[PDB]
Amino acid sequence: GANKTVVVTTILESPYVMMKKNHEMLEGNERYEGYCVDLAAEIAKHCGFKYKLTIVGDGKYGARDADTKIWNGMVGELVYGKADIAIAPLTITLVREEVIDFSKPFMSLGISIMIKKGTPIESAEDLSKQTEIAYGTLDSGSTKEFFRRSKIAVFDKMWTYMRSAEPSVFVRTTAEGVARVRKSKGKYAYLLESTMNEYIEQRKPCDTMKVGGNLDSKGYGIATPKGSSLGNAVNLAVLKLNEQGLLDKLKNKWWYDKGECGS
Amino acid sequence: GANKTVVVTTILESPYVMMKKNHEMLEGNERYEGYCVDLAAEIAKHCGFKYKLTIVGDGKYGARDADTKIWNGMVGELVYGKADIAIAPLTITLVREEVIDFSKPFMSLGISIMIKKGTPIESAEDLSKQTEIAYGTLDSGSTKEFFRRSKIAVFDKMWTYMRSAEPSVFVRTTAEGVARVRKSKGKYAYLLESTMNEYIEQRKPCDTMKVGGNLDSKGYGIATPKGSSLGNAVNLAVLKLNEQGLLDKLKNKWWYDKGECGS
Numbered sequence: 001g002a003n004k005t006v007v008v009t010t011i012l013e014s015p016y017v018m019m020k021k022n023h024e025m026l027e028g029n030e031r032y033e034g035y036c037v038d039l040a041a042e043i044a045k046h047c048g049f050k051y052k053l054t055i056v057g058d059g060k061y062g063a064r065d066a067d068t069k070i071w072n073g074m075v076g077e078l079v080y081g082k083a084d085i086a087i088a089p090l091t092i093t094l095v096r097e098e099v100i101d102f103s104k105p106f107m108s109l110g111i112s113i114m115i116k117k118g119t120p121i122e123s124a125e126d127l128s129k130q131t132e133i134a135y136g137t138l139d140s141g142s143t144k145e146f147f148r149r150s151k152i153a154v155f156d157k158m159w160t161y162m163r164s165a166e167p168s169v170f171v172r173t174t175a176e177g178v179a180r181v182r183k184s185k186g187k188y189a190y191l192l193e194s195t196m197n198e199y200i201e202q203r204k205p206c207d208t209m210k211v212g213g214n215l216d217s218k219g220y221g222i223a224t225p226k227g228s229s230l231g232n233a234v235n236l237a238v239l240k241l242n243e244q245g246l247l248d249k250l251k252n253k254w255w256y257d258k259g260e261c262g263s
Numbered sequence: 264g265a266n267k268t269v270v271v272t273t274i275l276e277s278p279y280v281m282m283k284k285n286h287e288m289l290e291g292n293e294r295y296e297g298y299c300v301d302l303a304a305e306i307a308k309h310c311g312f313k314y315k316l317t318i319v320g321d322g323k324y325g326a327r328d329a330d331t332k333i334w335n336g337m338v339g340e341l342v343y344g345k346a347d348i349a350i351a352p353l354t355i356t357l358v359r360e361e362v363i364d365f366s367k368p369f370m371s372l373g374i375s376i377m378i379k380k381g382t383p384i385e386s387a388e389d390l391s392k393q394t395e396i397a398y399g400t401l402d403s404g405s406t407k408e409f410f411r412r413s414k415i416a417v418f419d420k421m422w423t424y425m426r427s428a429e430p431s432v433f434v435r436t437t438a439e440g441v442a443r444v445r446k447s448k449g450k451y452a453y454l455l456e457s458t459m460n461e462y463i464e465q466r467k468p469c470d471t472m473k474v475g476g477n478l479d480s481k482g483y484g485i486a487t488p489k490g491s492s493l494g495n496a497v498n499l500a501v502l503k504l505n506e507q508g509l510l511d512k513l514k515n516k517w518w519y520d521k522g523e524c525g526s
């Protein structure tokens with residue numbers, strides 16, 4: 001059949017996808033900017049397709065409801081045919097690989113700890129051994145599932161705390177978690193992916209920092225519906241852009257060239 | 264058809280695959296030990312197959328001869344049907360992805376610089392701006408191809424030097440490169456993957472070190488012949504073992520628990 005505009009699902013997450021300053025006066029894909037906006041343009045060019053960026057309807061990454069078995073977020077939009085490809089900071093996980101296809105990773109990351117500067121915390125073990133400082137995760141993503149499923153002693157203890165903590169320690173968006181770190185003044189630490197942590201560390205008011213090593217090691221992938229013909233070309237495009245140094249260029253562009261906390 | 268023993272191609276590369284001390288008195292898979300030996304056992308268990316470890320015939324990772332178009336190394340053994348799966352520190356690259364299938368990565372790495380302690384070199388740019396210190400790569404792997412294909416200014420200059428340097432700066436095995444660093448006493452630096460660099464840094468005589476950041480970012484994958492039915496199960500196995508923390512355990516086992524240069 002004739003070529004057709006590719007529906008891209010993505011998510012408003014800085015610096016991956018952000019509304020341009022003058023977005024109210026702009027239309028279509030020009031409303032948005034960021035790492036994944038640049039990446040979408042490069043993938044489309046190499047694969048030779050036109051595309052339309054759309055923000056995932058429920059603003060979620062993707063989880064399977066245990067009772068109804070329904071997928072939400074960007075994963076759901078792929079599973080149920082509402083989008084042709086997801087170009088976002090979407091983590092490659094076993095449960096997702098079973099229902100959608102993933103390119104080889106375009107970015108590496110791991111779960112990490114964000115603290116308000118001066119917080120007496122250096123590690124996940126530190127967090128698990130105390131109760132003065134609360135901590136939590138994004139409410140429906142791969143980080144929360146990591147703790148839910150972990151059988152590692154320290155991470156198991158953290159999950160037991162987080163799942164029952166009052167008031168809730170989970171947040172609906174990364175921005176809410178950052179905000180809670182900043183205004184709790186050392187009494188909340190946020191568990192999030194090192195990429196987003198490192199980005200926020202370079203943003204004013206420059207009052208947070210990443211502490212300790214990463215808790216795990218994983219990657220983001222471009223996702224397509226299982227068996228989609230688009231998957232092969234997209235995977236080769238990712239590998240080409242990585243070897244060309246383009247992915248490194250985009251990381252430096254959106255994380256550090258634009259750093260607001262000094263050189 | 265009935266189940267059949269899976270032929271695994273791998274390569275003698277420390278600490279991935281090594282001859283056991285008493286290998287002369289042992290048979291079959293028991294002759295070998297290392298990260299990839301443990302990994303092979305875990306993958307086979309989760310996928311439910313028996314296997315036989317074999318060392319790649321020509322001792323090479325894999326490259327395509329430009330004139331004959333013939334693949335050598337572990338890639339060739341997969342392409343031409345001599346092995347069913349490769350379980351080794353085999354880098355995922357575009358040219359290889361076109362001819363074989365790769366799991367999602369089981370280990371991350373990047374090209375890195377190894378120096379004799381005290382060598383006045385901190386970066387690839389440092390190397391490219393001088394001639395007193397020679398430098399080279401493994402003779403037929405992904406690192407050499409990286410420099411051959413790079414259009415980045417600094418890496419292009421390094422390749423122009425290395426490809427024409429006299430005497431040859433390329434080595435047949437990692438051990439030869441390490442040996443040349445050690446006995447050139449600061450007048451040779453070796454370009455190799457950060458994983459192998461980090462391992463050697465923890466081995467006696469503790470006279471080398473990794474300097475600077477990595478030049479790129481990539482991963483190792485389990486490789487199967489293109490379209491092989493084994494690929495899907497192996498990929499899910501890799502993802503499961505990563506999320507279980509097994510891959511991290513194996514890295515610590517073979518790199519740092521066994522470190523010989525202190526704590």
Ligand SMILES: N[C@@H](CCC(=O)O)C(=O)O
Pocket residue numbers: 061062089090091138140141142143144191192193
């Ligand atoms: N990248 C994650 C969302 C962020 C997080 O869970 O920390 C996902 O794909 O679910």
Ligand SMILES: N[C@@H](CCC(=O)O)C(=O)O
Pocket residue numbers: 324325352353354401403404405406407454455456
């Ligand atoms: N891992 C590399 C070999 C080592 C190197 O090139 O430095 C490959 O798969 O070709």
Ligand SMILES: [Br-]
Pocket residue numbers: 093095096141142145
């Ligand atoms: Br997940």
Ligand SMILES: [Br-]
Pocket residue numbers: 092105218219220367368
């Ligand atoms: Br991955």
Ligand SMILES: [Br-]
Pocket residue numbers: 244245246249
């Ligand atoms: Br580029």
Ligand SMILES: [Br-]
Pocket residue numbers: 356358359404405408
């Ligand atoms: Br290659």
Ligand SMILES: [Br-]
Pocket residue numbers: 104105355368481482483
């Ligand atoms: Br990769």
Ligand SMILES: [Br-]
Pocket residue numbers: 507508509512
């Ligand atoms: Br385990």
